[PDB]
Design a protein around this ligand. Sequence first.
Ligand SMILES: O=C(CO)[C@H](O)[C@H](O)[C@H](O)CO
Ligand SMILES: O=C(CO)[C@H](O)[C@H](O)[C@H](O)CO
Ligand SMILES: O=C(CO)[C@H](O)[C@H](O)[C@H](O)CO
Ligand SMILES: O=C(CO)[C@H](O)[C@H](O)[C@H](O)CO
Ligand SMILES: [Mn+2]
Ligand SMILES: [Mn+2]
Ligand SMILES: [Mn+2]
Ligand SMILES: [Mn+2]
Ligand SMILES: [Mn+2]
Ligand SMILES: [Mn+2]
Ligand SMILES: [Mn+2]
Ligand SMILES: [Mn+2]
Lengths: 421, 426, 418, 420
Amino acid sequence: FRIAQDVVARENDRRASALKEDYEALGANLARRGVDIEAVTAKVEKFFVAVPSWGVGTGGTRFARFPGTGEPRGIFDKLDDCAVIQQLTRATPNVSLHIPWDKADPKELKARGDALGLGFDAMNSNTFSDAPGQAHSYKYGSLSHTNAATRAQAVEHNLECIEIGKAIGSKALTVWIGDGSNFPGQSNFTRAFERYLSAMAEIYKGLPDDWKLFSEHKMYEPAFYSTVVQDWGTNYLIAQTLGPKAQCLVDLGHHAPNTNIEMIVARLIQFGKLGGFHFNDSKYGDDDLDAGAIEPYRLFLVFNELVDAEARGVKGFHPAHMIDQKHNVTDPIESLINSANEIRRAYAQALLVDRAALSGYQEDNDALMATETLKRAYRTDVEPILAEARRRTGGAVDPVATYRASGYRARVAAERPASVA
Amino acid sequence: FRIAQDVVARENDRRASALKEDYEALGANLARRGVDIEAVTAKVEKFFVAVPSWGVGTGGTRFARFPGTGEPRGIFDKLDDCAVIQQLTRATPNVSLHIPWDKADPKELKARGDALGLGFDAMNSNTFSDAPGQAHSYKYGSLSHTNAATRAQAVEHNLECIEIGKAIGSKALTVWIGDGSNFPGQSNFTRAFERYLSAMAEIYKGLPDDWKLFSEHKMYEPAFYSTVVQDWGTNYLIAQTLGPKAQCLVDLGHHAPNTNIEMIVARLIQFGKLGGFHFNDSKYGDDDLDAGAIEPYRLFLVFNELVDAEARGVKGFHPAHMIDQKHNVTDPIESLINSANEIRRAYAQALLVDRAALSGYQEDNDALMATETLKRAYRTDVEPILAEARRRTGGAVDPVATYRASGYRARVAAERPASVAGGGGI
Amino acid sequence: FRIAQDVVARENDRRASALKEDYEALGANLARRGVDIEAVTAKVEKFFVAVPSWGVGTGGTRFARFPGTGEPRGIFDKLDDCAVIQQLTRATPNVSLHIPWDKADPKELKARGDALGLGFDAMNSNTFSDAPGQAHSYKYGSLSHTNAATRAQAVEHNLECIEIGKAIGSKALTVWIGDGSNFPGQSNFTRAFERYLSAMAEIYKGLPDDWKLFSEHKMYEPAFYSTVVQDWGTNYLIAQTLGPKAQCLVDLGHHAPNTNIEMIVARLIQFGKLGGFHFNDSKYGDDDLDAGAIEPYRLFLVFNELVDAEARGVKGFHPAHMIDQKHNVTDPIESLINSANEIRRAYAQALLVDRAALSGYQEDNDALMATETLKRAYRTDVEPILAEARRRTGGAVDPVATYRASGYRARVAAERPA
Amino acid sequence: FRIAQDVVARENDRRASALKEDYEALGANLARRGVDIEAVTAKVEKFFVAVPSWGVGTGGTRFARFPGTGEPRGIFDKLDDCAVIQQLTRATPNVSLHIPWDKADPKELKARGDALGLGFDAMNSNTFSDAPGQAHSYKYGSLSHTNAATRAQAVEHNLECIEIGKAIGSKALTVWIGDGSNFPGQSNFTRAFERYLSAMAEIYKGLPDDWKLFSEHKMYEPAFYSTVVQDWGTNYLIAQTLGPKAQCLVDLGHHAPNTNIEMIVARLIQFGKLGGFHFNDSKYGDDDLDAGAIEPYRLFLVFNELVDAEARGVKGFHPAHMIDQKHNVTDPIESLINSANEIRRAYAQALLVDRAALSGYQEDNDALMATETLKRAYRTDVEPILAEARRRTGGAVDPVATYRASGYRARVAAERPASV
Ligand SMILES: O=C(CO)[C@H](O)[C@H](O)[C@H](O)CO
Ligand SMILES: O=C(CO)[C@H](O)[C@H](O)[C@H](O)CO
Ligand SMILES: O=C(CO)[C@H](O)[C@H](O)[C@H](O)CO
Ligand SMILES: O=C(CO)[C@H](O)[C@H](O)[C@H](O)CO
Ligand SMILES: [Mn+2]
Ligand SMILES: [Mn+2]
Ligand SMILES: [Mn+2]
Ligand SMILES: [Mn+2]
Ligand SMILES: [Mn+2]
Ligand SMILES: [Mn+2]
Ligand SMILES: [Mn+2]
Ligand SMILES: [Mn+2]
C-alpha cells in the first residue's frame, strides 16, 4: 500500500457523516425522478480509465519546464505513483506505457504491476523524437518519411512495442506521429498519406488475433502547416483501409476551434471505428489540461454519446478509455486523481439521463425539453455517488485531501534525486 | 450580345498596346524559366467555372438587405446578367440553377440559355426554407426530419429538380441542407444521419446514368449546435455509402477556423470522391465573399492540388467548378467577373509550378526550396495571360472597365423596377 | 395576469412537497459548508435581467425563418408575452425596446408596461437597416459612413431613440451598428473610426445627464472583413474618449474563437467601463442561443468575475444585464424563461464560492485547490434556490411546466390567427 | 566577410542578365502605371528588420528538437551567422539579444558586433524560464507573481537587461512573459494585472530618457487558460498607464483565430502606441513560421497600414521591426534570409498602392475598385526591385542561392562539433 490504510481510514471516517447525508439526500431526489442511485453507483464503481505513465511526472512547454519535488526517476517510480492514484480513486487500475520512455525488462514491468495491483492498457509508440543510435532521424517524418529505410525503421519500432505489450498483458497499440509539413509544397499530401498507409499495413500484419491498432489524429503540432493524420476523416480512411483490427482514437484537444467533437464520436461509433479516447481539457489548442477543468459540459456530452451507444444496442462496443494529460503547474498525482474523478462524474451524469423521455422529445422535435432533459442529468451533483463508489472499493472519500494528509509527496521527494543535467 | 460589340472592341483597342508589352515581357520571363507562355494561355482559355443564378442579385444578411439598381426580376433577368459575365470573361459558360427560386418552363429556360450562349451546370435543391402551399415545414429538418412524410416530401422535391435538369441539359444535382440542431440533445446524431442516408438513397435511385449527386458539407449555419453533413469526413461516408455516382462538394467557406482545406481536396481526389467546388473567400465564417479577395494564396494552394492531379493525369477526373458567393456591397455582376478572373488567376499560377523541381525538393526534404518553388509560380503576375486569353476568345482585356464603359447597370436599372430595402434574407 | 393565478397556484402546490425536500436538503448541505441558504435565496430573488422585445417572436437566419403559432404581431403583443416571462420567473421585470421595430406611441407603451408589471431598460437604436422614407441608405455604413448627411441622419435617429426612452422610463441608449467593410481597402480603418468617434460625440452631447451611452463591439457580421467597433479594445477607446457616461457592453457571442471572455469582463470592470451585458450562448459565431445551453461553465465564470468585483470592494459598479438572443427552433417564451433561469443559476453558484478559501489558494499558488474551490460552487445544484425564490415572489416552481399547463401558446395562437 | 566577396560577385554575375531584363521590364510596367521604379528601390533599400539571435539556431517543439549541422552555440557563434544574413540581404543590420541566453561581456559583445557590421536592436528579458541558481522560480509567474520577492527578482532582471543594452547601443527593452494561469480560479485576473502594472512601473523608472519599453501581448502559451497580457486591449491599457516611453509590440502569430490583425495595427498607430513588430507567419497558433510563407496577403495588408500611416504623416509613427521566428525543419539562416525578403516584398508592394485612387474609391464606397487597387499593387512581382536593391548595396541577387554556393553551412559544421 503506497498510502497507509490507517490514513485512508481516518480521512474516510472524518467525512463519513457528511457523505451519508449527501448520498441519502441525492438518493431520495433521484428516486423521485425514477432513478435508483444504487444502480448508478454500481456502474460507476466499475468505470475505469487508463493513466498515462508520461503524465505522472511534471510536464512543460517549448518555453520551459518547472519540475516539482520527487519527480519519478523512471518507469518503476512512475508505476509506484500510479499505484497511489488507483488506491485512492479506484478508477485507474491500468497504466498506458510509452516506448522507449518506459523501455525496461517486460518481466520486471509485469512483476511491479502485479505487485501494485496494476495492469497495462494500450502501448504507445514513439517516432516523433529520435532515440540514441538510430540509423535514421525522424526530423522529416517517420512512418510517412520519403526514405523507405526510415519508414522500415519506424515499422520495426512499432513491432517492438507490440512484443513488449504482449509480454506485459497489453492488447493494443496506439500510434500517434508528428508527421507533416511546416510549409506549403514541402510535402505531397497524397504521397505522404500513401507512404503512411503502407507502413501501417505492415504494422497491422504484426498484430495478434486479439489486438487492436489505434491511430490518433491531430490537427497540428509538431507540424504547423499540414499533418498526415490531421483529422477524423483521414483517421476513418486509415481504419477502414487497414482492417477490422484497426480503429480510431479521439483525443479531445486535437480538433479545430469550435469543432463538434461529440458528433465525431457518434460518427465513428456508427461505423464501428471508435477505438478509444484520450481524455483531457483545453481552451486554445492541444493544451492537455485536467479533464473537465475548462469545459465540463462538453465532457458530459461526449459521455452522453457513449451511453447512447449502449442505449441503441450497439454490439461489440468496448472503447478504450485513457487520460492523456500533461501537468505543468500542479502535483501530477493530484491532477490525475481529480481528472479521473471528473471523468467518472461526466459518466455518472450521462447515466442519469432519462433516455425514454429524451427519445420522445427528439421524435416530437421538442428541442427545449430535449436539451433540458440532458441538463437535468448534468446539473445533478453526483459527487456523493463518486465518493461512495470509492468508499466501497477501498478508495478515499476525498482522494486529494487523503493524499495530502499522507505526506506522500514529501516522502518520495526525499527518496528521488532531482535531475542535475 | 448583352454588351455592344463595338464597346468591347473599343475598350480592348484602348488597352491593346500595354497588354502587348506586358504579355511579351511575361513571355520572355517564362521562356527564361523554361515555360512556353502560349501553352499556359491555351489552357487558361479552356478553364471554366459555373456562375450561380442566385449570385447576380444583391445578397443580404439576417440583419438587412440593401439592393442596388436594376435588380433581376427573376431567372430570365438573371440569365441575361450571367450572359454579361460570360461575354466579358469567357470563363463562365454555364449557370447553376436553384429550385424553386428559378422555377420556370424548362423549354423557355433552355431557349434563353441557347440564345445567350449559356449552358446549365448542376441543379440545386432547396429544402432549407418553406415555399408557399408547402404541406410539411422544414423547420426541424428535411431529408433527415423525424417525420416520414416530411422526408418523403423532400425526396420528391429533389426528384423534381432532376426532372427539370434533364429537360435543360443539366447533369448533376447538388444537395445542401440546413438539417441539424441548435441544442444538445435536440437531435440524436446517429439516427438523424441514418435518416439522411436512407433519403439520399431514394434520390440516388432516381439519378440518370450520366448524372452525379453532390452532397455539400457545412460546419454550421443555419444549425448552430450540430449539422448532419457537418464536414468532409461525414461527406465521404455519404458518398462512399450511396455509390459511384455520389461525390463530395467542397465549399471553401464551410470549414472550421484554420482548417487545411487544400488537404481535404487532396484526400477526396485520392479516394475518387471530389465532386467539385463552391468557390468564394472568407475571413470569419461562411462569409461568401469574392474568391481570392481575402486569402489569394489559399486559393492558389487549392489549385496546386487540382493541377497536380491534372498533371499526373488522373483520368476521368473532371470536378465541377462553381462560384458560390453572395454580393452584399458591390455590383453582383462586377464581383462575379473579378471572382471568375481570380479563379483563372490561381489556376494559371498553379500551371507555372515546376512539378519536376517540386517533386525533387519533396523527395529530398528541402522544405525551403519546395515552398519557394510554389512561390515562384504564385508570385508571377499572370494578368497578361488572363487578359490575352479573354481578348482572343471574344472577351474584354479589362472586364470590369468594359462593363462600366458599357453602362449596362444603368441600362438594366431603367428596364427593371426599383427595389426597396428590407430585413434579413439571402 | 397573462397566466391565471389558479394555474400558477395549482402547479406550485403539485411540486411543493418535492421542493421542500430539495430545499431543506440543500440548506443542510450549505450549512455544513458555512453558508446560509436564506442569504443566497434573498439575493437570487433580487437578480434581474432585461428581456429583448425582438426575442419574443421567432427568429431566423439569412436562409429562412420558420414562425411558430401565435406569433406576436407587434410591440404590444410582445409586451403581453414578455409579461408571461416575468410573471413566471420573476427575473425579467424590464423589457429592452428596439427602434424603429417597436415604434408606437411611447405613452401607450408605458401604459401597457405599467398594467403588465413591466418596466423598460436601455433603448436600442437601429442604423444597420433601412426604414421606409429614409433619405440616406445605411448600406455602406451609418455613424461612420463617408457621407456627412448619412452620419447626421444616424445621429438624429439615435437622439429620437433617447426621446422615446425618456417617455417610458429608460435611462440608457445602446448603440450597435454593422459598420465595417467586406473587402480589404474598402475602408480606411482609421478614418472610419474617426468618423464614428465624431458622430458618437454628437450623440453623447445630446445624452441626458441621467443616462448612460453603451457601445457594443462585435468581431464580424454583417461586415465580413473589418468592423469599426470590432472588439473590447476599440470599445474601451470609444468609452474613454466619449466621457464618463459612456461605457462598454459585452455580448457573449461577439468574440473571436477561444477568447477568454471572463477576462475581458474583469478588465473593463477594473477600468470602470463595463456598462453591461448581452447574455446568450454560442458554439460557432454569434449564434444567439439560449444562455448556458452550450457552455454553462463559461457563464458561471463570467458571473464569478461579477461577484468577485463586489468581494474586492469595487464601488459604483451596477452593470446593466440584458438577454440578447434569437429563438429559431423553440417557443421564444420558453427559451427566454429557461435562459433567465440559467443566468440566475450561474449567479447563485457564483455566490456560493468560498472567497476566503479561493483567495488563500490563489496567494499560495495552489492551482488545483483554487480551481476545485470554484467547482465546489459550480457543481452545486442550485435549482431548489431558484425555484423557492420564484415561489416566494409570485412565480412558478417550474416555469416552463406551468407555462405549458396554462395552454398560453394555444391561447395566443387562437387570438392571433395567421 | 562571412561570405567571400568573390563568391558574392560570381553568383551575382551569373544572375545579372536575367535581373537586368526583369528590372527593365518591371520598370516599364510601373512607368505605364505612373510609378518610378527607382523611387521604390530607394525606399526598399532603407527598410530594415532586426534578426533574433535565438533564430539562427534550430528550434523545436515540446515533443522534440532535430538540430542541423553547424549549430551555433552561444551569442558569438550566433552573431557570426546573423552577419551572413545581413551581408547577403542587406536588410538585417541589427540583432535582437535575449538575456540570459546571450550573456557575455558587454564590451566584447559590442566589439564583435562592430567587427561584423551588426548593430543591436531591442533587448529581450527572460522571466518565463528558470536559470540555474535562481533564488525564486517563475513557475507561477514573474512580474505578476503573488510573492513580492519573486516580482522584485523579475524587476531586477529587467533592469539588468537595460544595463546591458545601454553598454551595447540598444535603445529599448521588450518584455514578454508567460504569466497567466492554466485553471479557472488559479489567478485573480485583476489582482494579477495590478501586480504586473506595479512591477512594470518600476522597470519604467529605470529607462534612460531615449529608451522605449515594449510590452508584448499573447493570447496563450505557456498559459493555457488565461494570460495577463493576453491581447492588444490589455496591451494598450499597459502602455497608456505606464507613460509615453511605453508602447505595444504586435507579434503576428499571437492572436485569436480569424483576428483582423491589420486593424489592431491601425488602432495602435492612431493612438501613438505601435512600438513595433515581431514578424512571422502561422496557420494554427503561435507557429513562428517564416514570414509570408502561409499568408502573404495578410503580411501585405499589415504593410498597407504601415505605408498609409507614413503617407498621411501620422504623428509619433516609428515602429521598430523585428523577426521572431523558430526554424524547426530548415536551415535557420536560409529561412531568416527569405523571411527578411518576404518582409521587404510586402513593403515594396504596399509602396505601389495608388493612394490617391484608393482614397477616391473609399470615399465613393466603390468597394470593388478599392480592393482591386490594393490587388494591383500586391499582384506585382517586386522581386526585381528587391534583388536590384541588394545588388547595388553589396548583397546577393539570390541570397539563398549564393548562401548555398558559398558552402557556409558545411564550413561552420566543421568548426562546430555536433552532439553526435
Ligand atoms: O496526444 C498526443 C500528442 O499530442 C499523443 O497521444 C502522444 O503520444 C502523447 O500525448 C504523449 O506525448
Ligand atoms: O453554401 C450553401 C449554403 O451555405 C449552399 O451551396 C446553398 O445552396 C447556396 O449557398 C445558396 O444559398
Ligand atoms: O447583438 C447585436 C447584433 O449582433 C445587437 O445587440 C443588436 O442590436 C441585437 O442583437 C438586435 O439585432
Ligand atoms: O513571442 C514570444 C514568445 O511566444 C516572445 O517574443 C519571446 O521572447 C520570443 O519568442 C523568444 O522565445
Ligand atoms: Mn493523445
Ligand atoms: Mn495531444
Ligand atoms: Mn455552397
Ligand atoms: Mn455556404
Ligand atoms: Mn447584442
Ligand atoms: Mn449579436
Ligand atoms: Mn515575439
Ligand atoms: Mn511568440
